[PDB]
Symmetry: D3
Subunit: 253 residues, 6 copies
């Protein structure tokens, strides 16, 4: 077998990819989302009740479908990053990255030694299909994609330094964390926050990195797409399930 | 502790109850549905990948919320009915009921001996809260509700006979199975099917039983409510999740 | 490897075995029970929320301990009996047995062809340790033990006929089901019920079969042991957990 | 989306398909088997500790790979057959089929009304991808494959009658059950059994049906392939895992 | 919907709350505990085999009952604290707190930016009921309760400094860890240990903080309640299950 | 009950123990491996999709068999080590140990206070059988075995210093991580790597510590056994399952 090509990673340079957040934390729900036709699905190990085993079940569900899987670990934890890569996650989204030093550690965490620090266990890994991908250890690094989140004042304070890290493929802006950090918790739509988001997207792209964001606000999402944002998540499964059931009930009260 | 009052069962005589089908087969998804405010939630053990243990998880999730749980077993199987009653399901929906003889057996399956054949194991049952409901074996039968589905030609051929069974609280019409049985598979909206459905609702209510139905078609659901249908399910969680995610993606393609 | 000797089955003829009911339906809780020193543990697939997979987890937990595992299926279902034997349950307790014809079917359901109807799949079975027990298909039948429950009027009406079935190792009396069948639901302690239980134990033993029963009433349990009852379960894990936690709280209200 | 084409079903008429039995009862183990390149994988719900939910996880794992999934239910149970079809199993292997009447019931169990009795719930079914296969109810039946097992004296007594059932796509011979039925339990390699197997294969093919078998004996498997047997399973995951670990240990004792 | 009021947190100032430790690590066992009537239940993620997903199942079980849930994470890990708050735990018990610096970090870990560092993901959180609690991000912090454990010499060496941390609602003494730290492992009952515990309770309360402790010794527990200790756990589910089953067997040996 | 004797730990001084890696991450697969007769089984929490709960299931499966369980946590994380010891793992294998300071911290992480920092919760621990091992807190430390991995340049740079740590029972060489660290990723068989491995084994044994290694290469494994290596793992369950299934298919293509 050849290593699974990371099309998400290639398309960061060629198109704008539309994403759906997957926080229902279940292989069955992940498969439902996989049928819709999103460019990428974000399996959330930070804000949904997921662990390595439940994320593996969702990777296995999604794998039959063209949607690219991206996984968010709970934090930039080197050993957890090792575990998620070995179950076969090819694109990681690291929350709350706040320095070039931390971003560089995340780059190494995703790459085999001697250049990186990713632990080696290809005989045991779905990532290598248990060495049925016979050249995995040679071809793995080329298909790994690292995305880091800037979503704090310290992240913004180190933005130019993070953008100079070779191996950071994309910077994703987190409006919920960033608006709370700025003292506008629950209110990212305020002009003070949105002007910082727009300037941040412009700086990310000017440095030759892919920019990303999540917004369930259709008008904001379309504005970010108009600015050239490369990876835009446009909703969340938990939110769509709740809202669709509420809207239906309201027709009957 | 007092036995949990079956408000669904009482309200069969006092109001029209709006329902949501729960086929996502998971305690987490069942809780999301429980927050919306439906009168009843149908945990589907016939057409969703559920078993006694996954249904128990969903009963435990929903139990903190006012929505009444109804469970559909895969068939009118007496020992499975015993298992579902003991994990604490107070309202059952039996598919494909086709005779007064079968409806009477379902009545007995839901009631303790000597009047019925429900197996006795109150020390072990969530239903009795492990005997923390001190008088459960005396008070249980009063709070159990039996619903049967008419959804075949043979069911329609035995409708008057099923409607004379004491202990059948409600008859639910299944438009998907019934339209297929009538040779209009995938097309319940046809006049030939709808005339049979409307006449069937009228007969159910004339015999003093509650009538029920599921339709994801808003106009049909409102027509059934106008006709006095007592328990109307108006959508399905799997369908709403898929439709909401597809409608969103179509705004961005 | 040698087939696991069924010591429960041997001891039916040599001693009185003390049992604990296991309805917590989990491998971890079963292991806690397995540490205490009961002669037998009853994994309840009738009145606790168990299935083949949860029962397997409990067999694996208990297997490291001398306590003998007995499994109760939800009903006398031939294919389910096949599944339980293959995961390695060596003693079955069949509820609600009501005729010599049904008891004979249960005997055949536990024995390989050509003398019985137990389905053959030794390559896949924990029971054979995946054929690591090299002569399993020759040695299996000798270590299987069948227990049937008499706990209805129809069972009592067929008691002498059930007691003449070769291959029925034991008859277990279910006081909860029997007292409900007799119109004393929740009140097995009534003299009318107890006189029937005592006469039944005497007839079981007169016919050279092992007698069994469950009672959480210490005085009744000791009376049954004084009458020579071979397998007596003396409590239930769910009941002991609830009572122990309630008695403790009552010291502090 | 178009309905998933059942290539296993087509290839019954065009080639000989090599199979692997999947009894490790786990989505992770099923995915390992899916990487090897077998024409078909048999997810065993009869002799491995599987249920609807664990079979669904294995279907989801395998679905990313070319291997065709075949599922064996514990028995020819109409409601269980309904459940397995709705989770998306397109080929079923029914054990212990013993009459043309039973085979005909299995045909109906796999087909929608009005011609069959498969329950209709396409909104809830992975089989329809929750109606994302928009014409599922029209196109489903064409991709369902029914295989029945002949593996008892009564099955052999009704072989010609079973072979005249329209809708039976294949007859699979079970050597373990059949050798035990014939009084050669554990010894299917005896000439008396093998002559009956060879005559049975010849009769199945003469009637224009696909013949199948499992044998872990390479010489027997190759003989069955030389006789034109259309679907031949050549090993079992549990057996290969045990044997590979034992052979390795024996090099070191 | 209104944010769930943290009654445990209010009652720290108005009454003495009786607790039960929940280490059976399962939603079903947690529900049994929830029926008894304890003021609080401690879901142990430090000393019972729990993770975010098993803790979530137990929160869902308990939620239908008045008992207040308190969760103990394995350590004072900021990202794990984030995960536990989002699944909706409103009271945390942090083990092995040893400095005012660590206690201050734990305060911030429980509070939203800009005043704290709790990660923001209300669209995905059971805690906000997936934003069905419309003002969650404004009302969340007020209902969060932080308890820290003093149970080492270094904790005792920093007690006065920990007691001056605003946002520490309570200090819980761990007698097992503390007696081991003091060189009396397995012997907390020694006067040397007890005099330190009593002095510590008095200092906690003198500083206007709630004091807590676990003791399964009824006499010690009642002494702690007479000293005014606000939150006293009086037993452990695993210990009560084992002891209850052993005491019963001893009546029969 | 007496504490389970750690025979693995004793045999480090009296024989050479043959091991199998268990990465199938499931209680059912762990039991299959347990039947073969390996001296030790390595439940891999670093390179297989395991967590505390899935490792517990595997410890419970294996516990009925003489094979000694060794657990590898994802990293030298003190609170995770606490969790693994309490579910009853008596031998740990810590990856990527790089200093005497880190090895000393791992020694303390495995021993109760006051000498170590292992958290005390014996009422809740499978390790104490919930205190059914009456003197566990006095007898525990004697049966715990600590193994550390040297598998980086920094580990080799600190080898003499790690070998002088009292409480390190064994040093295990990781050829996959070490060959990658040395710039021969996927090529441990190179003379440059093998000379370092052989010299490292000689130094480990000269310092009076047990030496260990994993090699799926039969010749290398036998060379390591000839050199006196005390604990040699000779294969991996995932690799054997894949290889056995591929070798079989190649006989039929
Ligand atoms: Ca199940
Ligand atoms: Ca987990
Ligand atoms: Mn964020
Ligand atoms: Mn229907
Ligand atoms: Mn009974
Ligand atoms: Mn067979
Ligand atoms: Mn403690
Ligand atoms: Mn390594």
């Amino acid at each position: 077998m050849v290593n699974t090509v990371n099309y998400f990673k290639q398309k960061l340079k060629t198109e704008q990819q539309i994403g759906m957040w997957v926080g229902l934390a279940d292989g069955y729900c992940a498969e439902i989302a996989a049928n819709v036709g999103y460019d990428w699905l974000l399996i959330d190990g930070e804000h949904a009740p997921n662990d390595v085993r439940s994320i593996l079940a969702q990777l296995q569900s999604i794998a039959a479908y063209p949607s690219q899987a991206v996984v968010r670990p709970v934090s930039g934890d080197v050993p957890l990053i090792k575990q998620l890569l070995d179950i076969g996650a090819q694109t990681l989204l690291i929350p709350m990255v706040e320095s070039a030093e931390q971003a560089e550690l995340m780059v190494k965490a995703t790459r085999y030694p001697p250049e990186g620090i990713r632990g080696v266990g290809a005989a045991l890994a779905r990532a290598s299909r248990w060495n049925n991908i016979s050249d995995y250890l040679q071809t793995a690094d080329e298909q790994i994609c690292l995305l880091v989140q800037v979503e704090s004042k310290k992240g913004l304070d180190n933005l130019d330094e993070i953008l100079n890290v070779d191996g950071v493929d994309g910077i994703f802006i987190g409006p919920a964390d960033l608006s709370a950090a700025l003292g506008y918790r629950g209110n990212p739509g305020h002009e003070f926050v949105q002007n910082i988001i727009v300037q941040t997207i412009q700086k990310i792209r000017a440095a030759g990195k892919a920019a990303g964001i999540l917004s369930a606000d259709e008008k904001l999402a379309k504005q970010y797409l108009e600015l050239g944002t490369e990876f835009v998540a446009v909703g969340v499964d938990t939110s769509l399930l709740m809202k669709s059931m509420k809207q239906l009930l309201s027709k009957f009260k």
